[PDB]
């Protein structure tokens, strides 16, 4: 139904690959070819799917009925989720070496900056299959189904998630203070405090972010990355990447990634996906 460009190489395999190891179940749905999922905008609601053509560079959107109305806030979440506006020879000449055996690799971001503040919060200090397991639950619990397509249920509202029992998300799966760090979330995006949109200073913003409760380093790192689609931000304190920097602080990996500036989020995505990759000795 509508189609947005993307340059040259996009890699359709390891994106789709990484959007399926994180799939909500019945909020999401990833295949070899297709990426599909419930959207809501406002009161609108349906379904999106995204479909590319590898040889056209063309990436074809398809809603149902309910999201027409807010047709193109669609596509622009879209174009946010998968990363369209990327210029990968810029990218891979800065990044060079590190970038070889992945050039189409794009950073993954997302469809709404409150979910994915839902989802960073969710993925602390647990594996990616449990977080989806956990917001799988979170969304069935909390979220509401379409009527006109019963099987996909839409994310958690801010509004419901705001006047969740703490003890109701404990139950699903998680501390209490994770589950009171939603709930403050949730009235952040009901105040127009969570910023919607990557802000103007990256910086300033994850400094206010990490004054909510419950939102280290690593959730405000991990949140503006995808959820702002920041793209200068490493993560320092991420399990796998302290494996791919063999004992070494997350000052001293702080310190080498300072090599990859202003591209440090994607110089993060090539290194969580080089199996054997490891640092140059000084």
Not at 46 to 51: E, Q, S
Request: aromatic share 10%; glycine share 8%; hydrophobic share 45%.
């Amino acid at each position: 139904m509508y189609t947005l460009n993307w340059q040259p190489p996009y890699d359709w395999s390891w994106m789709l690959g990484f959007l399926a190891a994180r799939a909500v179940s019945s909020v999401e749905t990833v295949a070899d070819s297709y990426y599909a999922r419930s959207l809501a905008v406002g009161e609108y609601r349906g379904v999106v799917t995204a479909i590319p053509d590898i040889a056209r560079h063309t990436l074809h959107i398809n809603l149902s009925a309910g999201l027409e109305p807010v047709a193109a806030e669609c596509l622009a979440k879209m174009s946010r989720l998968f990363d369209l506006q990327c210029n990968p020879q810029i990218v891979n000449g800065a990044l060079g070496r590190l970038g070889a055996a992945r050039p189409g690799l794009r950073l993954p971001g997302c469809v709404d900056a409150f979910e994915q503040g839902v989802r960073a919060i969710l993925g602390q200090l647990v594996s990616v299959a449990m977080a989806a397991k956990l917001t799988a639950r979170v969304a069935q619990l909390y979220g509401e189904r379409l009527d006109d397509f019963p099987e996909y249920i839409c994310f958690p509202t801010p509004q419901r998630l705001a006047a969740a029992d703490p003890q109701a998300l404990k139950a699903l799966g998680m501390p209490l203070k994770r589950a009171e760090a939603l709930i403050h979330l949730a009235n952040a995006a009901l105040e127009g405090t969570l910023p919607m949109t990557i802000p103007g200073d990256v910086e300033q913003a994850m400094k206010t972010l990490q004054t909510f409760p419950g939102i280290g380093r690593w959730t405000a790192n991990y949140f503006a990355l995808r959820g702002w689609q920041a793209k200068d931000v490493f993560l320092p304190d991420d399990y796998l990447i302290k494996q791919r920097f063999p004992g070494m602080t997350p000052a001293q990996i702080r310190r080498y990634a300072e090599r990859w500036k202003p591209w440090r989020s994607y110089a993060l995505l090539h290194i969580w996906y080089t199996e054997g990759w490891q640092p140059d000795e000084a």
